């Protein structure tokens, strides 16, 4: 990955002082969710970032 303005995001996340993540109900209609790749191996199989949803065509 790559973070444009990486310093700013790191700074504000550090200042917030928490990684508390509240899952919201997003409704992605007509696309495949939970995309993954073999570069990011979660468990034995392919995976992805746990806080990001890779939407592909359905």
């Amino acid at each position: 990955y790559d973070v444009p303005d990486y310093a700013s995001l790191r700074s504000l996340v550090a200042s917030s002082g928490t990684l508390e993540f509240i899952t919201e109900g997003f409704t992605w209609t007509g696309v495949t969710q939970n995309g993954g790749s073999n570069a990011c191996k979660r468990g034995p199989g392919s995976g992805f970032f746990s806080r990001l949803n890779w939407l592909t065509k359905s």
């Binding site: 303005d5 310093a7 700013s8 995001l9 700074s11 504000l12 200042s15």
Partner: protein
């Protein structure tokens, strides 16, 4: 209080003194009298009257500056602005604290020195005619009427014409 005059060997202020800052209380045959020394009071007041204009001349004039209050959270640039303002505030607060402490210390030493200088000047006028009793008060060893006392306060005390009588009174 570097010289030990004020809060030292004087040991007490005079709330009845309203004429000036430093002065004399004399007691002789005629009766007790009190006066203030204008020269020492004026010197101390002159040295105190400024004392803050001589370092911080005045207020400099600032018109357009950075923003110091922010609504959202941007990141690097807001962090830098907050840091710059906090650094400036801390440095100027330290400057204020140190300046006030130094000025207060010097003012106290200055007034103590003026008291000591008045005492020494008076002691030097009374070369051998008087003895310092140690509580900041001189014992003069001859008939010294109000004209004599006002000559002491004036600075024109003629020590030569009382030297014989004073020396006879002291050493018998």
């Amino acid at each position: 209080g570097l010289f030990g005059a004020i809060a030292g060997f004087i040991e007490n202020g005079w709330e009845g003194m309203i004429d000036g800052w430093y002065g004399f209380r004399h007691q002789n045959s005629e009766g007790t009298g009190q006066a203030a020394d204008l020269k020492s009071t004026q010197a101390a007041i002159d040295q105190i009257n400024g004392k803050l204009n001589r370092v911080i001349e005045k207020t400099n004039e600032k018109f357009h500056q950075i923003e110091k209050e922010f609504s959202e959270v941007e990141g690097r640039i807001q962090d830098l602005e907050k840091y710059v303002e906090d650094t400036k505030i801390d440095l100027w607060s330290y400057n204020a604290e140190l300046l006030v402490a130094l000025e207060n210390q010097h003012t106290i030493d200055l007034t103590d020195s003026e008291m000591n200088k008045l005492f020494e000047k008076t002691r030097r006028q009374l070369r051998e005619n008087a003895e310092d009793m140690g509580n900041g008060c001189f014992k003069i060893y001859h008939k010294c009427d109000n004209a004599c006392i006002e000559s002491i306060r004036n600075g024109t005390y003629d020590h030569d014409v009382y030297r014989d009588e004073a020396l006879n009174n002291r050493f018998q």
